[PDB]
Design brief:
By secondary structure, this protein is α+β, with helices and mostly antiparallel strands. Helices cover about 25% and strands about 20% of the residues. It has helices spanning about 60-65, 100-110, 120-135, 190, 200-215, 225-235, 240-245, 270-280, 290-295, 335, and strands spanning about 1-10, 15-30, 35-40, 45-55, 75-80, 90-95, 100, 140, 150, 160, 170. The structure holds ligand VNG. Ligand VNG binds next to strand 2, strand 4 and strand 7.
Length: about 350
Amino acid sequence: KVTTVVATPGQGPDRPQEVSYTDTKVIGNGSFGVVYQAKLCDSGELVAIKKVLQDKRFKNRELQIMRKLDHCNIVRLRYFFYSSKKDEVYLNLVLDYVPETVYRVARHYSRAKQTLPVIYVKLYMYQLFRSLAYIHSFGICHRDIKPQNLLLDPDTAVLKLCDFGSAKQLVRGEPNVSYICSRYYRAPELIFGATDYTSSIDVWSAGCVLAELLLGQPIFPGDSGVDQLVEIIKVLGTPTREQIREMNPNYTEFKFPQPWTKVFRPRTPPEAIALCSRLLEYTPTARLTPLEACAHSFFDELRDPNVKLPNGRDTPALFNFTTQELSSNPPLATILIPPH
Ligand SMILES: O=C(Nc1cc(-c2ccc(-c3ncon3)s2)ccn1)C1CC1
């Protein structure tokens, strides 16, 4: 049937208006609770409702971040409402329903042994670094960059950052947990038990999803944090004593105490391999900033005026830059916004 509730509009002021929707179905689950998909009775727009349980004697870090974020490549928080077993409540996050994720379209290609077109790979990754450079400016680290958290529309080719329950405003001094992120996309510093990491861990996970697109399979598949490090050393090579010191110092076992360059599939664009190399660096500082990655030579086909999607539709919102977005090296604005 239909259901109406009083929700405070996200990002906007505290003016709880009434929202009514129908046709609710579960599109996902998790430890937080469950995410639904409903249809707003007005305009018939399909949304997503994330029912996360929360103790009333606190404040959801996700909700605080989502209300302070507004970017084309980030799923906007439309509204939010509570619908609660004593000192607890269920926080429901109403967001725009993006119809697909990068993992699903990547799996559909992997099920047929076909590489995703580089045009798709270049547009998705660029929209990822654009959302990263946005959230990284405010000092927020997603801490869960994965293809399942990279929503995408098939027609408009618009990608948006999905989850934010693992994100935290990384401040100086404040120690944060190490065992974060998905294993296949976890940075090496987190495996070594570093509590002083920066937002460059999202860049490592960005380099991992890039390789998964140019290879049809996860680049670093392990069953444990230690096993994940063996996959990294097998490809990236043995980290030197400086890089092991650039991250947290710790001793670790291994299957053996043993850097193949030819790892990517044939016909892989060399410009992407150069980008993926600057992203998957042992040293967290050598990793390109999300804005520095946007200005890479691999993202030059999109910066061309005559760029167009396969279905004839023009390039989606590729520019639309803000001063906050360019807080890291504003000089690079001419490469992020060509005269085109
Ligand atoms: O899920 C699907 N669309 C979908 C999802 C979301 C989400 C937002 C937050 C989410 C979450 N947080 C933790 O865990 N999940 S999920 C938003 C919009 N559309 C269908 C198409 C595949």
